[PDB]
Design a protein around this nucleic acid. Sequence first.
RNA 1: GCUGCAGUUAAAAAGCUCGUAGUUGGAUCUUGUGGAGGGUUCCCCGCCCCUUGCCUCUCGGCGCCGGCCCGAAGCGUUUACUUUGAAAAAAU
RNA 2: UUUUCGGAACUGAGGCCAUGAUUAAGAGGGACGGCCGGGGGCAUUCGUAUUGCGCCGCUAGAGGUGAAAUUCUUGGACCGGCGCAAGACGGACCAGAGCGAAAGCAUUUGCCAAGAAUGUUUUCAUUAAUCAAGAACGAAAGUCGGAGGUUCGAAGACGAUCAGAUACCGUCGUAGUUCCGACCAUAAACGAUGCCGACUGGCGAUGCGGCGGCGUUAUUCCCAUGACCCGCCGGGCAGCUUCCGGGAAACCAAAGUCUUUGGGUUCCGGGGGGAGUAUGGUUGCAAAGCUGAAACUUAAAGGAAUUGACGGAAGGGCACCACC
Lengths: 129, 142, 84, 150
Amino acid sequence: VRMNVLADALKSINNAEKRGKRQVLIRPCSKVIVRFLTVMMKHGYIGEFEIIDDHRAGKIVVNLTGRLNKCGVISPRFDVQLKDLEKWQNNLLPSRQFGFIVLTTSAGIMDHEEARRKHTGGKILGFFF
Amino acid sequence: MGKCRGLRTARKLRSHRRDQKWHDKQYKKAHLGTALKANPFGGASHAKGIVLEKVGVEAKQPNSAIRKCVRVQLIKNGKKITAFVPNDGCLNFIEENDEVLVAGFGRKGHAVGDIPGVRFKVVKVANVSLLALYKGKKERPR
Amino acid sequence: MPLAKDLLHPSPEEEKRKHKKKRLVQSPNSYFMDVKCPGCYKITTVFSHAQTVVLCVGCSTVLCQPTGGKARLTEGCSFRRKQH
Amino acid sequence: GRMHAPGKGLSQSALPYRRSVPTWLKLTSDDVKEQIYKLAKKGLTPSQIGVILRDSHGVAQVRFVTGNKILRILKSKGLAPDLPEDLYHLIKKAVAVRKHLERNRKDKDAKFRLILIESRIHRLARYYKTKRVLPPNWKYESSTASALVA
RNA sequence: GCUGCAGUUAAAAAGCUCGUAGUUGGAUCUUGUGGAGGGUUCCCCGCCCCUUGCCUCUCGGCGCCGGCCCGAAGCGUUUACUUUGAAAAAAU
RNA sequence: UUUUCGGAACUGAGGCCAUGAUUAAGAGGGACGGCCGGGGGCAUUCGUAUUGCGCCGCUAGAGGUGAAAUUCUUGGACCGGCGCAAGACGGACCAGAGCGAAAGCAUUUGCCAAGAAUGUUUUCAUUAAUCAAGAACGAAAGUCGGAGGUUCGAAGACGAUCAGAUACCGUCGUAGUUCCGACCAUAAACGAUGCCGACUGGCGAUGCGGCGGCGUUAUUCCCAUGACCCGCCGGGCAGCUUCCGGGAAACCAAAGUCUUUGGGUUCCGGGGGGAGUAUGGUUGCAAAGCUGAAACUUAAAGGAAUUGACGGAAGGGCACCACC
């Protein structure tokens, strides 16, 4: 089994970062995982990543720095309504000055600072800081 | 954790908690109500009775004293309680076969101090408080 | 790990000695071979882990004895890749 | 892991990336069809058929030289069996267990093992009947086991 | 103790397995360019095949010079979800 | 009267569609191959011992204990030799080895069905995980009905020891121990550690399969093959090692990835007693099992670790206030 793909991915990157590894191996790839890691890269918590291709489900290899501290999954996937947002944002972030809870909306996957500017809630996926 | 965290598991949570709340000690007295039924009070703060006879109770070890209680039967439930007399020499201000007003000790069903079997004290002997008898703000009406 | 790992590119053949599904891209390690034993001049093609007796239609008609691993040959002749 | 044993193992086959290999193959699509039809006549069933093709001929898989597979090829004829070979092999097995149990009645170990294989029939059946590959009136029984094995 | 507990020895995992309900369930089916709003690519019209998917038309306006063009009419397999409206007695 | 138009239904043959099938899981099921194991059932072979019996020989004590005695004995025991019968049982080889869902499972050979791991460019295409109800198996003791009855042995009867001794010890001995057919569902049924999945150090072994190899050895010089040597890949029982991390600590590569709290799911706990009792239900022939309170009482009960003291514990050493 592996009922949550996203949940198994992030624990690897958490464990790896602690030891100090700067290359990892994450499987299986999913499109959901790609856009996740895209957001995590833009802000600058991780570096460029390579998708190896198979004909099964792919595998991914990542280049990372010590900048990452902790990325989590939130299971099950709750709804957020842009007043429920603030209650969430307190609990998952160590500060008001940094960290980004991530979520998916009908306007696509993005961080919370961006979602508030689209004025649309949606389903929450994970978090990080 | 160690428990389900589905998004459709509201039933299995809300029925489980409603069951495991019954093992709690406080809850099990409150909600069975057998506490009230067993109590010589109806659950009222005080109660009124009529004196039967003075008694003395010898305190639990290591302390040794005689604690000068009374024994009283109640009006509103017709059953008997052994009740402490506070201050010094207020045994004398109680006279047998009169009414008194009783009240719990202050530990809610459990004997207080070194005296065993006594969960009650006494406040009024004839509409005149033990305080005012002792201090001298009032006097026993004979 | 020494923390110097390279997972972008595989190791020369230390990647190709691991279990077949722990390789970066999966592959079998089995192969075919084009066999022509004496006296029946035809290009027969046979799988390395055949599982079964393979026949020839000439004078010869036995070529394998089944084994759990690679099947034993009845006469030690002919190995090809072939090609890919 | 195994559905009624504790073990956890690996022996799963792994295919190559490239599927146009090995690029010398004798015979082409139409030829492969008649090669298959001959085998199904002789009492072979789709798993056996592909083995006997792969081992002694240039075919790796019929998937990689046609748009079909072994079962679909037989199905286009109407020469496909009436129920999956998978389902059959479970039912085929459980009769022999019941025979051993009649011949020896102190074998509690056998009695236990029958319950496993029995439940494994019902589970497999509950796949097929929802996919309409069996009658929805069909049910497994002692009686139906007798008739389908002989 | 949902947020937020605990189960080797402090209270505590059914002797063990099977099994219907319940709960939970792998991957897979789309990206770049001029104008407009904000940077130096990136987020209302369009373009490569698509772009609010279609037609068919006909009745009641808008046009241009009988003839022709485009808004309103059926809808995109269904839900949840999210966002906006409508709708809500007072006192507190 | 007749078409047309419009609406509807049913029937044939033909054009036009890149004319229609996602991938095949380091998910599962199923086939195939060579093996493997105190796995299970049935049948069969064998060994020695023990007790009793028969036969032969030798003569005075034999058993047993801390010390004794009950008890046994010139028709001779005990002991030695030879033969016979019965039932029980598989020693040494047998280990931080194997197999089994758990409880469990060691003489030979045959038969009957079953299973794991590994190998696989075969097949199926999500068929899964965990689980109220319900179901199978489940030591020892016990109950019912038969068979059998050596050995050991609750009960029981004696002999000692002790102030006493219904006990420890010795002798005798019933139920039982054994098998067959029915019940009974409990255990420190203990790794006192749910099941499934992912990730994160090192090293050497050992059991099973597969792969590679310079070396030796066994037979026809061989090949096929076995034994040993060296290394690799799976999955299994374990060990050693340490500033991964955890923990109250003991300790643990999981009891880790946890206030930086959320992988999936079942069962279960809430101070110590009262109590697995009361009570009603349900199951059982019986014995009992499961489900299972309250009144009332009390400020401690308990875990780990440290320092002392003590020991009819172990190892060193010493004294005529100790002994020889």
